[PDB]
Enzyme design. Structure first.
Site, PDB file in Angstrom:
ATOM      1  N   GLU A  50       0.867  -1.146   0.000  1.00  0.00           N
ATOM      2  CA  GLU A  50       0.000   0.000   0.000  1.00  0.00           C
ATOM      3  C   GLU A  50       0.899   1.188   0.000  1.00  0.00           C
ATOM      4  O   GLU A  50       1.715   1.339   0.863  1.00  0.00           O
ATOM      5  CB  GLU A  50      -0.833  -0.005   1.271  1.00  0.00           C
ATOM      6  CG  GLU A  50      -2.041   0.888   1.231  1.00  0.00           C
ATOM      7  CD  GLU A  50      -3.182   0.243   0.451  1.00  0.00           C
ATOM      8  OE1 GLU A  50      -3.468  -0.973   0.665  1.00  0.00           O
ATOM      9  OE2 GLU A  50      -3.812   0.939  -0.381  1.00  0.00           O
ATOM     10  N   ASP A  61      -5.139  11.897   7.654  1.00  0.00           N
ATOM     11  CA  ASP A  61      -4.042  11.243   8.387  1.00  0.00           C
ATOM     12  C   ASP A  61      -3.603  11.956   9.646  1.00  0.00           C
ATOM     13  O   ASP A  61      -3.693  13.111   9.732  1.00  0.00           O
ATOM     14  CB  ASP A  61      -2.842  11.139   7.469  1.00  0.00           C
ATOM     15  CG  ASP A  61      -3.112  10.232   6.292  1.00  0.00           C
ATOM     16  OD1 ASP A  61      -3.165   8.985   6.483  1.00  0.00           O
ATOM     17  OD2 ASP A  61      -3.270  10.771   5.168  1.00  0.00           O
ATOM     18  N   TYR A 176     -11.275  -2.182   2.540  1.00  0.00           N
ATOM     19  CA  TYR A 176     -10.501  -1.606   3.599  1.00  0.00           C
ATOM     20  C   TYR A 176     -11.392  -1.282   4.826  1.00  0.00           C
ATOM     21  O   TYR A 176     -12.257  -0.424   4.745  1.00  0.00           O
ATOM     22  CB  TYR A 176      -9.840  -0.326   3.053  1.00  0.00           C
ATOM     23  CG  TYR A 176      -8.783   0.323   3.964  1.00  0.00           C
ATOM     24  CD1 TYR A 176      -9.139   0.874   5.174  1.00  0.00           C
ATOM     25  CD2 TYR A 176      -7.444   0.471   3.550  1.00  0.00           C
ATOM     26  CE1 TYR A 176      -8.194   1.522   5.972  1.00  0.00           C
ATOM     27  CE2 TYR A 176      -6.504   1.090   4.334  1.00  0.00           C
ATOM     28  CZ  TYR A 176      -6.856   1.602   5.565  1.00  0.00           C
ATOM     29  OH  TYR A 176      -5.894   2.234   6.389  1.00  0.00           O
TER      30      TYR A 176
END
Length: 259
Positions: A50, A61, A176
């Site tokens: 990834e 993030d 995911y």
């Protein structure tokens, strides 16, 4: 389900083993090291990769990953370097699935068709756009399909069955989960995906430790994606190459060993 991803998950299935999928931002701490960073990951048991492209403000993030993006921008990494790295890794590893974890605005700046053609030629297998939600994705999924690539989606922690249903239909290679499983709920969400014929679920949130890799499989996930925990190694040894790689290899082997 999609091309390299299927074959890997079929082989892991016969092995009775989960998938260990590490994540790095390409170019962190620099392009040359980033590359051996990736290499070490693969030589020490990574089942898929990834990869982020460096992006100045990665709004989904935390500090750690923010760190890596800004290191890669500072080392002066460009799109073309990123794609160069991906293409070298493909030639060295023809079968290793490669996933991209990207920010929309990153894609659009390159031009969508421009970006996904570049991805196709480098040999990438899936693209996940982190900051767009399933319902808004068409332009990107549409681009993903026209260029041989799997659109990957996140099932977020609060997710309701309708959302989870379209994550499942949309939706290729792997799905995911922005969640983890508890060391000794999730099981519910997994079951819902399994009965929607969702692509194989990877637990991708705060996986840092082999016991957590272990637990994820134990709950029905096909594997775990580990993000920050790797990057943290990178940051601790960005100026000492040989300790970086050593400790990165040790980490993969331990994490993989728990699949």
């Amino acid at each position: 389900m999609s091309n390299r991803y299927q074959a890997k998950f079929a082989a892991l299935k016969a092995q009775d083993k989960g998938a260990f999928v590490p994540f790095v931002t390409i170019g962190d701490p620099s392009p040359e090291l980033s590359l051996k960073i990736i290499q070490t990951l693969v030589d020490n048991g990574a089942d898929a990769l990834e990869l982020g492209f460096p992006f100045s403000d990665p709004l989904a993030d935390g500090p750690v990953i923010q760190g890596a993006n800004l290191r890669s921008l500072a080392a002066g990494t460009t799109s073309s370097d990123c794609f160069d790295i991906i293409t070298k890794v493909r030639a060295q590893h023809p079968d290793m699935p490669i996933g991209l974890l990207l920010y929309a605005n990153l894609v659009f700046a390159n031009g969508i068709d421009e970006f996904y053609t570049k991805a196709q030629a480098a040999g990438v297998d899936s693209v996940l756009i982190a900051d767009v939600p399933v319902e808004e994705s068409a332009p990107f999924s549409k681009a993903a399909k026209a260029h041989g690539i799997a659109p990957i989606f996140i099932a977020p922690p609060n997710a309701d069955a309708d959302t989870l249903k379209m994550v499942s239909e949309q939706g290729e290679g792997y799905t995911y989960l922005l969640s983890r499983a508890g060391v000794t709920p999730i099981e519910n969400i997994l079951t819902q995906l399994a009965e929607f014929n969702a692509p194989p679920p990877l637990l991708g949130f705060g996986i840092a430790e082999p016991e957590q890799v272990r637990a994820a499989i134990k709950a029905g996930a096909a594997g775990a994606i580990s993000g920050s925990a790797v990057v943290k190694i990178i940051e601790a040894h960005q100026h000492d190459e040989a300790t970086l790689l050593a400790k990165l290899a040790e980490f993969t082997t331990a994490m993989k060993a728990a699949t």
